[PDB]
Design a protein around this ligand. Sequence first.
Ligand SMILES: *[C@@H]1O[C@H](CO)[C@@H](O[C@@H]2O[C@H](CO)[C@@H](O[C@@H]3O[C@H](CO)[C@@H](O)[C@H](O[C@H]4O[C@H](CO)[C@@H](O)[C@H](O)[C@@H]4O)[C@@H]3O)[C@H](O)[C@H]2NC(C)=O)[C@H](O)[C@H]1NC(C)=O
Ligand SMILES: *[C@@H]1O[C@H](CO)[C@@H](O[C@@H]2O[C@H](CO)[C@@H](O)[C@H](O)[C@H]2NC(C)=O)[C@H](O)[C@H]1NC(C)=O
Ligand SMILES: *[C@@H]1O[C@H](CO)[C@@H](O[C@@H]2O[C@H](CO)[C@@H](O)[C@H](O)[C@H]2NC(C)=O)[C@H](O)[C@H]1NC(C)=O
Ligand SMILES: N[C@H]1CN(c2cc(-c3ccccc3)ncn2)C[C@@H]1N1CCCCC1=O
Ligand SMILES: N[C@H]1CN(c2cc(-c3ccccc3)ncn2)C[C@@H]1N1CCCCC1=O
Ligand SMILES: *[C@@H]1O[C@H](CO)[C@@H](O)[C@H](O)[C@H]1NC(C)=O
Ligand SMILES: *[C@@H]1O[C@H](CO)[C@@H](O)[C@H](O)[C@H]1NC(C)=O
Ligand SMILES: *[C@@H]1O[C@H](CO)[C@@H](O)[C@H](O)[C@H]1NC(C)=O
Lengths: 728, 728
Amino acid sequence: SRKTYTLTDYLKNTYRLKLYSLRWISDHEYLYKQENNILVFNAEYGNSSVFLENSTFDEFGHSINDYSISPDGQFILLEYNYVKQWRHSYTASYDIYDLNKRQLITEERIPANTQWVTWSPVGHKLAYVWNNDIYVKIEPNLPSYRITWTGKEDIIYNGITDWVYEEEVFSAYSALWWSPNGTFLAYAQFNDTEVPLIEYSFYSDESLQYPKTVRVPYPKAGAVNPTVKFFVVNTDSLSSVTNATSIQITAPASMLIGDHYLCDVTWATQERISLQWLRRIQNYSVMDICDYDESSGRWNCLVARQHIEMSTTGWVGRFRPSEPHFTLDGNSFYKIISNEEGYRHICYFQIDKKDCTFITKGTWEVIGIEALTSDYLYYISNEYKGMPGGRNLYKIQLSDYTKVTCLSCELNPERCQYYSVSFSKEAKYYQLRCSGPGLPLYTLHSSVNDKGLRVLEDNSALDKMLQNVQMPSKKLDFIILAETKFWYQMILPPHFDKSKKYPLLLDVYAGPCSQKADTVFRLNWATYLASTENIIVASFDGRGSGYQGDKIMHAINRRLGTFEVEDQIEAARQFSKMGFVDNKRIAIWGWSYGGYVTSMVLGSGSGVFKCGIAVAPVSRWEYYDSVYTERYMGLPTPEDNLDHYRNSTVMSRAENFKQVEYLLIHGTADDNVHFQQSAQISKALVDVGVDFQAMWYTDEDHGIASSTAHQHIYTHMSHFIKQCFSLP
Amino acid sequence: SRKTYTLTDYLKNTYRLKLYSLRWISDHEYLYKQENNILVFNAEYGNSSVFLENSTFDEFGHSINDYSISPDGQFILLEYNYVKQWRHSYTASYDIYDLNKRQLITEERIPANTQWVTWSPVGHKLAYVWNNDIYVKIEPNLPSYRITWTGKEDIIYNGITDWVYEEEVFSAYSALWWSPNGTFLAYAQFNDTEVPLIEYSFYSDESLQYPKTVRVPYPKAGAVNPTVKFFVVNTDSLSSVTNATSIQITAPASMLIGDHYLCDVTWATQERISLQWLRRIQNYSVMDICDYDESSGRWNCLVARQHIEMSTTGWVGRFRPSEPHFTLDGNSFYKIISNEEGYRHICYFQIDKKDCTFITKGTWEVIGIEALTSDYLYYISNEYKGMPGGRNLYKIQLSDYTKVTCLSCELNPERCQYYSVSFSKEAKYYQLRCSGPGLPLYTLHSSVNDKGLRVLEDNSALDKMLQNVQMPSKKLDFIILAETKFWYQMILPPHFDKSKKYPLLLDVYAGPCSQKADTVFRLNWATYLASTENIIVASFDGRGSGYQGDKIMHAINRRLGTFEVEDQIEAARQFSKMGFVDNKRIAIWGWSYGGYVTSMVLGSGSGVFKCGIAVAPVSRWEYYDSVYTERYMGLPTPEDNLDHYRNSTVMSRAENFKQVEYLLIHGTADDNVHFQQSAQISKALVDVGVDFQAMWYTDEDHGIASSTAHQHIYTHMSHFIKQCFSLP
Ligand SMILES: *[C@@H]1O[C@H](CO)[C@@H](O[C@@H]2O[C@H](CO)[C@@H](O[C@@H]3O[C@H](CO)[C@@H](O)[C@H](O[C@H]4O[C@H](CO)[C@@H](O)[C@H](O)[C@@H]4O)[C@@H]3O)[C@H](O)[C@H]2NC(C)=O)[C@H](O)[C@H]1NC(C)=O
Ligand SMILES: *[C@@H]1O[C@H](CO)[C@@H](O[C@@H]2O[C@H](CO)[C@@H](O)[C@H](O)[C@H]2NC(C)=O)[C@H](O)[C@H]1NC(C)=O
Ligand SMILES: *[C@@H]1O[C@H](CO)[C@@H](O[C@@H]2O[C@H](CO)[C@@H](O)[C@H](O)[C@H]2NC(C)=O)[C@H](O)[C@H]1NC(C)=O
Ligand SMILES: N[C@H]1CN(c2cc(-c3ccccc3)ncn2)C[C@@H]1N1CCCCC1=O
Ligand SMILES: N[C@H]1CN(c2cc(-c3ccccc3)ncn2)C[C@@H]1N1CCCCC1=O
Ligand SMILES: *[C@@H]1O[C@H](CO)[C@@H](O)[C@H](O)[C@H]1NC(C)=O
Ligand SMILES: *[C@@H]1O[C@H](CO)[C@@H](O)[C@H](O)[C@H]1NC(C)=O
Ligand SMILES: *[C@@H]1O[C@H](CO)[C@@H](O)[C@H](O)[C@H]1NC(C)=O
């Protein structure tokens, strides 16, 4: 045979997966960027035309990072001077171009160093955050109205989140929610006054004589948490002479008694907001329904409308309480709830009524609700062929729950088992996105008869290129551990010989609600290790893994670093039992939570693993943030869960590392899993006389995502793995 | 045949060198700590008596770190709760025990967290520094008198130095000088108001949830330097009702015009102080002679008494201007000055007279002046057998300079070639300390007819143990480079075979005024590499090296990282020509300046070296302190020497590291050569796609001196050297 998938192919993106990233602008039209032009596509017919030529901004004088067309199509917001902050946050410069007048706006521009910009859902109003304060523009050429005056760097945040809310609660920077009409603007206010600061050196460029100290409010497990306030402004009654009036919506009494989080904001109608609150002890959540009082200007939340969601075996939701999906009248909603058997299913709720009705059931889970129309509810689930790592689109008939139709299951069963979807406004058309086991396929469909309209992207160019490469194969199967099915995946080398013994690398994450065994197609480091190095790369989903019910997911509750570590050891013991694995060449590696599990497995003294690599690992739960940690571990106090926080550290296992080859890697500017975590592992290994390998990446964060750093880390880990497996 | 000197022997200090640490307390007596007792010895006869049994402090309740007996013998100052700070500084708790009354002083105790304590030179007065302020106790049981009120943490320092003065100027924490009588107390005041702070994380123990940021005023090359003021207090006229009056002594006009340092304080008589000042441009120093005016209470320094010392080829002195050694009347003195040929010799100066008279000359240098009597001047030099790395004691007859007598040269010429000395007060006796080439020998002698009195320590216990070990040998010789002799040393394996090819490791420092080729006996890492691993460990003294004249030393002036790097490359090329070196197995390593040279040699693209290890290296001169850097490099400005600062970095040679195996090591709490230095090397290597090896040591400083860290680093470097040389 001929060429293999090399490390250089992975690092240099030689074999590009093609995407079809579309933006719906109505119930029947979408925008698409097809090189040097923006095109508008008609979903029913498929005809297109140039919406905007990229030649329009040749004389702009800055590199445009991104754009946003206003809902009415009248304006385009141009984003340039992009400066990345955390996982979702960034700062940028913004300019507005009038599409009808065909010119840039010179007067009353969005200021430089803007934290977040948002168009209203309809029309052309703007809400932006500058210096932690909210500003509203009714028209792009008109002056802004100031909404908040309390904004203070690292202390008060209006309309944007602090570190912990961005990372753990909202999974977004924005804390601004326009009403459907664009009449109201709802926002959250974060107060970090007494939140302790994580401090670290930033070395910057060679030209900087003195390193900079970065100071970030970050609550570690058990520390003072930021507080939250919720407000609503009427953007239609803004005065140029008088200051803007913000109406506060207070949290329920069952929340105000102690520490709590605002975990969800959903507009139900033009005058109704849904708010979900969660206690610091993350097993109790309350949903409030708040209506606008036209004859007072205030917002009232009846105690009778409050819906409580609690857990007896663990925490609420997968990572957070699930979002409600309101019916058009806003008097009822659907939401994914854990049932009496522990499976996550769609529940139907009526506002002034007692409980809920489950509309789905079974030994599988609903992944998410995608669309809701008058007649149907569209959702993604892993029901098909009882594969927890598969994803398909289904629709349930709202007039008969037994009438469920799989929409994606049989489109291409050998090639397509993992779908995601993008619905048009009002769900008239949908784009299906299959990500495996074969090459990604993008298709356009009509909700009317569920007829296929067009193939958008088939990846035929990649298909032909990959026919020319010795590609590895993927086996997706399960093993039995204590009368339960646990899924695993294996990346097997090309020309796989079952009578030959191959070295095995265990790729681990194993965090709560994780899934490493799935039907997704990937071109990654594992692709190179199996194709060029002839190493079996295995992944296993044990106790604590998600999408298989709470019996499996909650098994890890108040006990991180126990069953998920043990289950990785047992998986490797069982893979060793298969006659195609060299029992003397078993390695393990992982990033973030994966790094914590790798380190815990290496310090277990199982004797199964020869070597391992931990990238940016957690080492002790007290060093990680309060929101994520306390969700699974409780508080680190003698009354709560101190004993388990003390017994679940990497440092305490330092003695057992004498039995293994260990490579420890961490970025110095990691704002998420602080360098401190690895600084403590290295110190405990040195204190016990254990030799190991280390690598720091100057100014790299959790992702180690800088082009040169990404290439260096993978090159360094490849040399380590090859040396450990005696490969040339 | 039998056992070799193993890595474990080095790390576990299996073969300990015995010392004879004595403290002269008079012209004929000394103190010696001889197991469970402090003894007093009579030099002439050798008889002794117990002075203090350590059973006295069995019920003290703290571990005594050190002690200090008052000059009059009446009190002992006990040091406990020792907390190390920088190279010289520390904090401790102090208690005073009355030796006559045989009880602890319970009233008016030295406060906890005392920065520095000092007995007066005669009697029992105390001067201590607490919270950056000076305090004086006339008697140990009496209350203190406050001298200064200006003390401010990290800003104003009274009687103690800031970071830069401790490390570079005084090579000591103390900035307090009692007059011989103990009448006056002279002190320096340091002001660090506008000095920029170096900031770095301190991780501490596992129990610390948030890392601490350490902030130290540290001027990097070209930054704002601390300012200095000098004062004198009369300790005999201190009032309990009135505040202490400090008389300020102003720097000369030729110093006040810009930035300057106070570089030396020497009491000449009871009423005369010598002060040496140095300009920020370190080629001009002024010595001031200051006399007490009894009819004014003021100190006056005549401009006619000022002695200027300037350099035309480099900087003043070896590391700083040399100290004056005054004759009893204080009207004349002796100083080591560089002569017209560039050799450092003893100069004789008379106070109200124009220049000086050289009393020594030749192609060798005076290392230091050790004692001065009415008849003789005692000094150490490297004259014997023209060996720059040898050290011997000589005496010159003050009535005839041609009458020079070597006092140590012929005591044991095969065993003893490197001496240091300790004279009694008034120099009636001297202890000679020979540190090689054989095992250290400690002897006592009488000055009258230079008769050997006693052998104090012969190391006979080590001698017998080493007879049982396969010990390596040392060859000390020279090679010619551009018509000049340059010395090198080689640690050769036992049973050395000149017809066999051995791997070579080059051990480097090469800093200005350094010496790595000498006659001293050492039990170190090199001893193990040659004895167990059969590796030749070589060291070379090239351009910039000291004790061979200014032509060699000043060759590197305003050009660090040029000739000393080139000369290490040429030494290895010449060792390669010798037929006992494997030219394919040549490695290089160094610590501090040695790490900078190793990195510069590895990035030179010479192709001579296979691998190298740099421990805590300097990478760019702008990151290192102003005092040391500017001495050799000038200022990093375009009007001065910016072009060489920019051309002499490790980062700029990053491309050439593809040709070598590199191991980079640095401690994270290094307050001297900041971790920033290695953080910038690693980042430049990653930016260029160079794979290398790294190791950080959490909370270790420049020394990486913690027992567990010292063992780990040497174990890690040994594995690296062994794999690079293909050794099992
Ligand atoms: C962000 O959060 C912080 C807390 O982390 C919050 O700051 C707190 O503000 C309040 C009110 O401004 C202050 O509380 C007071 O303390 C001062 C003394 O320092 C007293 O004057 C106060 O007593 C008076 O007022 C009381 C009620 O208002 C009554 O007892 C009586 O009328 C008194 O006259 C009171 O105890 C406090 O200084 C801070 N806390 C901290 C830790 O800084 C801040 O306001 C928040 N910012 C926003 C925009 O929400
Ligand atoms: C798809 O094709 C139709 C039909 O040609 C386009 O609709 C026409 O174009 C303009 C702009 O909307 C109107 O002024 C005409 O009256 C329309 N004619 C008809 C017969 O509908 C349509 O815009 C095309 N869509 C895209 C996205 O290119
Ligand atoms: C060494 O021994 C001598 C002689 O015994 C000691 O000197 C004498 O002893 C006492 C106590 O100091 C004095 O009162 C006598 O006047 C001394 N006589 C002479 C002739 O010196 C001496 O103290 C001993 N030294 C040590 C350090 O033990
Ligand atoms: N901060 C922690 C957050 N996290 C998540 C969060 C989510 C998620 C999915 C849907 C909605 C909201 C959040 N899904 C997967 N992982 C892993 C991460 N983490 C865990 C420990 C180590 C470091 C790290 O970043
Ligand atoms: N700070 C720098 C100071 N230094 C010295 C100083 C002296 C010395 C000798 C007699 C009197 C006063 C000073 N002797 C040898 N080395 C090397 C060191 N240094 C140089 C660069 C790298 C880091 C370091 O500590
Ligand atoms: C939207 O919201 C309010 C009432 O909900 C109304 O007064 C306003 O003018 C509305 N605008 C529309 C429906 O276009
Ligand atoms: C929440 O957790 C605590 C602490 O483990 C527990 O005692 C309590 O019953 C929980 N709440 C619910 C609703 O189960
Ligand atoms: C220290 O120096 C500053 C200028 O940096 C000056 O304002 C201040 O007076 C000084 N303090 C003392 C005690 O000399």
